[PDB]
Scaffold this active site. Structure first.
Site, PDB file in Angstrom:
ATOM      1  N   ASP A 132      -9.814  -3.650  -6.118  1.00 31.89           N
ATOM      2  CA  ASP A 132      -9.113  -2.507  -5.272  1.00 31.89           C
ATOM      3  C   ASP A 132      -9.139  -1.313  -6.102  1.00 31.89           C
ATOM      4  O   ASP A 132      -8.740  -1.603  -7.189  1.00 31.89           O
ATOM      5  CB  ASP A 132      -7.568  -3.291  -5.021  1.00 31.89           C
ATOM      6  CG  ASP A 132      -6.820  -2.009  -4.470  1.00 31.89           C
ATOM      7  OD1 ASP A 132      -7.074  -0.785  -4.285  1.00 31.89           O
ATOM      8  OD2 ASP A 132      -5.460  -2.551  -4.176  1.00 31.89           O
ATOM      9  N   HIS A 150      -7.832  -4.941  -1.519  1.00 28.49           N
ATOM     10  CA  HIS A 150      -6.644  -4.352  -1.113  1.00 28.49           C
ATOM     11  C   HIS A 150      -6.408  -4.629   0.394  1.00 28.49           C
ATOM     12  O   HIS A 150      -7.504  -4.983   1.312  1.00 28.49           O
ATOM     13  CB  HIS A 150      -6.750  -2.710  -1.162  1.00 28.49           C
ATOM     14  CG  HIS A 150      -5.680  -1.974  -0.847  1.00 28.49           C
ATOM     15  ND1 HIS A 150      -4.779  -1.633  -2.001  1.00 28.49           N
ATOM     16  CD2 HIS A 150      -5.139  -1.209   0.199  1.00 28.49           C
ATOM     17  CE1 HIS A 150      -3.858  -0.949  -1.537  1.00 28.49           C
ATOM     18  NE2 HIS A 150      -4.040  -0.662   0.028  1.00 28.49           N
ATOM     19  N   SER A 189       0.865  -1.304   0.149  1.00 32.29           N
ATOM     20  CA  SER A 189       0.105   0.102  -0.111  1.00 32.29           C
ATOM     21  C   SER A 189       0.968   1.187   0.046  1.00 32.29           C
ATOM     22  O   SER A 189       1.544   1.511  -0.954  1.00 32.29           O
ATOM     23  CB  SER A 189      -0.680   0.054   1.362  1.00 32.29           C
ATOM     24  OG  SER A 189      -2.165   0.263   1.219  1.00 32.29           O
TER      25      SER A 189
END
Length: 311
Positions: A255, A285, A160
């Site tokens: 995502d 995600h 991320s």
């Protein structure tokens, strides 16, 4: 439901995800952070019980911004290293919330993982985190013998915001003429804060973990000025990509940040950088931290560990 064919583990986790504290349920990032990190860290305390590592050392090093704590998980001395940067939108999470993940990587590979405790926003605005991550990474390269790691096998990676940081670090190293990074591992990274993509619009709302609202909130906390969004150390997708390290990019099917990550991988290929773009189907995600109950996460982790073990 989102699109349809989502791994059944998510439907089983419905209560869990819905019971997590939301960012907009607090007046400041700090309070939100404390509430959400508390939960993540306790879980990790439970998981780490099952991820034994010969030695885990917390060290304080000198970054341009001041002290930087790093956690060194070393399963075996004189081994390859992965310098890791945790996710959390540049605002939340910590070394403790990704402790189980890093232990597992170091344990499976019989190698070393150095997890960086970088400065968080809004307390420290972009680019403080980028510099903390770069400084810690260079410190690893410069202290090879002391850390007992193979200086010829240094990797960087993150999930991320962490994947964004690994990319930024690689660029910063390239720009400085440094060549110690042998591979960059980007796990569903955010690489763009300025342009939209079909996935951004398609999953902008309706999915657990990430939606357009919290994404905008994260960037508001991260950047001190709107125009900082176009900085190449932030929207890395616009940086010069020549000579960057070979990349392994892992994306999640459901995502908003999916297309972005894949496009960044295609751009690296055009620029002559070797890269693998692997889309895991049926997951969202942040899926890698759910490896105790999601096989896709255990296999994603196996891909990172294989890199430290195999040649």
């Amino acid at each position: 439901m989102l699109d349809m064919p989502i791994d059944p583990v998510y439907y089983q986790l419905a209560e869990y995800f819905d019971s997590l504290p939301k960012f907009d349920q607090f007046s400041s990032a700090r309070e939100y952070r404390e509430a959400i990190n508390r939960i993540y860290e306790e879980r990790n305390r439970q998981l780490s019980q099952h991820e034994r590592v010969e030695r885990v050392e917390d060290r304080t090093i000198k970054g341009r911004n001041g002290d930087i704590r790093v956690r060194v998980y070393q399963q075996k001395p004189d081994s390859p290293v992965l310098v890791y940067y945790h996710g959390g939108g540049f605002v939340i999470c910590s070394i403790e919330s990704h402790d189980a993940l890093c232990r597992r990587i170091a344990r499976l590979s019989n190698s070393t993982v150095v997890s960086v405790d970088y400065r968080l926003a809004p307390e420290h605005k972009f680019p403080a985190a980028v510099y903390d991550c770069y400084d810690a990474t260079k410190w690893v390269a410069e202290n090879a013998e002391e850390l007992r790691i193979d200086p010829s096998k240094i990797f960087v990676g993150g999930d991320s915001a962490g994947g964004n940081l690994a990319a930024a670090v690689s660029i910063m190293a390239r720009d400085s003429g440094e060549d110690f990074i042998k591979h960059q591992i980007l796990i569903y990274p955010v690489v763009n804060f300025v342009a939209p993509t079909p996935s951004l619009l398609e999953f902008g709302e309706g999915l657990w973990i990430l939606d357009q609202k919290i994404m905008s909130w994260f960037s508001e906390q991260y950047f001190s000025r709107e125009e900082d969004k176009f900085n190449p150390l932030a929207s890395v997708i616009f940086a010069d990509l020549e000579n960057l390290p070979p990349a392994l990019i892992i994306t999640a099917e459901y995502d908003p940040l999916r297309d972005e990550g894949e496009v960044f991988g295609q751009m690296l290929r055009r620029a002559g950088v070797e890269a693998s773009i692997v889309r895991y189907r049926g997951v969202l995600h942040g899926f890698i931290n759910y490896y105790p109950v999601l096989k896709a996460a255990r296999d994603a982790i196996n891909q990172i560990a294989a890199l430290l073990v195999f040649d």
